[PDB]
Structure formats: structure tokens, C-alpha cells
A = this chain, B = another copy of it.
Amino acid sequence: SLAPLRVGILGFGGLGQAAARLLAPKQEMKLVAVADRHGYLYDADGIDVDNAVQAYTQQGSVGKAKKGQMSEQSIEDLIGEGEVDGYFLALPNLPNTFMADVTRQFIASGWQGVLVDALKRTSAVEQLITLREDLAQAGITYMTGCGATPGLLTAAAAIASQSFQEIHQVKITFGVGIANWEAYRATIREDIAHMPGYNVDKAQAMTDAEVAALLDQTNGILALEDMEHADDIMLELAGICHRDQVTVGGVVDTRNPKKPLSTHVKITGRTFEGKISSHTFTLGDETSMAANVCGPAFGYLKAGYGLHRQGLKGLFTAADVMPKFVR
């Protein structure tokens, strides 16, 4: 707290804005940097979040905030702009290479430190796997899948697995309750993308009108079974089970701030005594999606910093490392 961690956020939709608010009260982490598609804001003394949020929602970019800069390469520019020990990539992976793309800009930039994401999709994480040496070579400690699921729930499964000689299944069921879908438009467009009638390009092609139409069919409720979800490969890399034994589904209600069911992960395996059994980790209904994503993200940023500081670079997943509570 004489030397708080200095962090940035890239992407300033609803999730990135939540991340900024989560950081405000912290003593040992300081938000110094935000970027969005058309602009960036840096302030070594701490970002003024109200000002950034107003600028963004009202004028379309944080580049329009008090000390903001407009730019069509905000990321490139922000990197060079000053001292940041790590960034949270709050960005939707759009186009579906954009995280890796942004990651390559970081690789390319000559910057070193900690990066963290909250990617959801097995295939986006694979794109990051391909870069793991390039990361390590660049001096970057990259923490992937460090949100709710993957992330928190993936780490819980990794811990839970220690009671068992062999794991038979890891089943995640998540609930999301948001007041209206626009509040997390990207997140909702990303869910729709991995819905059986659709895909990523068609999802992004859709208008807000057509989105609202789809949601009307079911009173704003999306029931997603066996989705693509990087929990699977993360638990495989950690040596716990094969990806096929990991299933992820959930319900998102876009017309209610109450969570439509309790988010949980169930871990089933066989003990050395040949008993078959299950542990369950359940999240409280009043922990929002934003809290269960961004809290772990910064706990992993702090952990990643610990690893970076002792010279460990490369790609780490939530299943590999103990996140560290941020105060």
C-alpha cells in the first residue's frame, strides 16, 4: 500500500466498468489505465471511475473523459503511456482472434508484466496455448480463464479433486440474472453465439432488434446445455481429468437481477477405497456475475504478479495457481 499494484482494464463494456468499481475501494491495487475501442484514459494517481463511466456511456469512449485521449489504436498507445504492472482483458474476444491479437500486441510491444483474461471458450484458450512460449520469451505472465467459469469454479474443482483416486465428472451449472440484456451486451451476444441455432458471426451480425426478438420467445431466458467451455482443457492441463469429463451448462435470465438458479460445480470421482462420490461447491445467489468474474480475475492478477516477480513467465490457468486475495 506504499507500493500498490498498478493495473489497467482493456474493454469498458459492462464487465470492464464493473471491474473498475470493484477496484475503487482497494488499498493494494490501483486502477491507472482503461482502454476502449476508440480511446484510452491514463492517470497514475488513480482513475476517476465516475468520470470514466460518464465519458463512456454518454460520449461513447473513455477517451472523452477529463484526461482521456481518443485513438483508433488505444491499446498500442496506452501500453507505452506509463507504468502498469498488469492488465485485465475485459474485452470480448471479437473477432474471435482479438484476445490473441491483443496478446500479440503485448508480445510485440516490449512490455512485460501480468495479463489476465476471463475467456470462456475452449478454442480461444487454445489460441493462447499456441503462444505460451512467445509469452514466456516476452517476459509476460499470462493468466487465462480467470473469471467465474472458467476461473473460480475451475479452481474449486481442482481443489475438490484431491479427495479422489480418479475423477469421473466435473459438472458446472451456472445461473445469471441481469436486469436487462444491454447491460452486458457482449456477454449476451457471446452466449447466443454458442446457442445451437447460431454461431459467432451470426451472433455479431444480429441487430439489437433481432436479439430482443429471440429473447421474447422465452421471456428473456437462455437455457444453455453442454456449451463449449475452456474449463475442460484447463482441468486436462492440470492433470485432473480429460476434457470430455467436463460439462458446462446454465441459465441466463435477461429480465431479472435475481439469479435464476444457484451456480455450482459438482465433482464426481472414485476414492482409494473404491467409493464413488461427489463434492459440490455452490455460489451465493447474491454474488453477481460481475463479482464472480472480476474478483477472481484480480486475485489471479495478484497471484500472477507473485509468479512474475519470482521469474515465472508463460501461460497459467486458474486450475494451476492459488489466486491471492486482493485488499
Contacts and interface: CB of A to CB of B under 8 A. Distances in A.
A210 to B, nearest CB: 31
Given A322-B158, A322-B322, A272 B284 contact: no
B281 A279 contact: yes
A285 interface: yes
This protein's copies in its complex: 2
Contacts of A159: 152, 155-156, 159, 322-323
A296 B165 contact: no
A314 B283 CA distance: 34
Contact of A291 (B22, B152, B273, B285): B273
Say which size band chain A's interface belongs to.
35 or more
A149 to B, nearest CB: 12
Given A279-B281, A325-B240, A163 B25 contact: no
A163 B286 CA distance: 11
A296 B156 contact: no
Interface of A: 18, 21-22, 24-25, 152, 155-156, 158-165, 238-240, 271-273, 275-288, 290-292, 294-296, 299, 310, 312, 319-325, 327
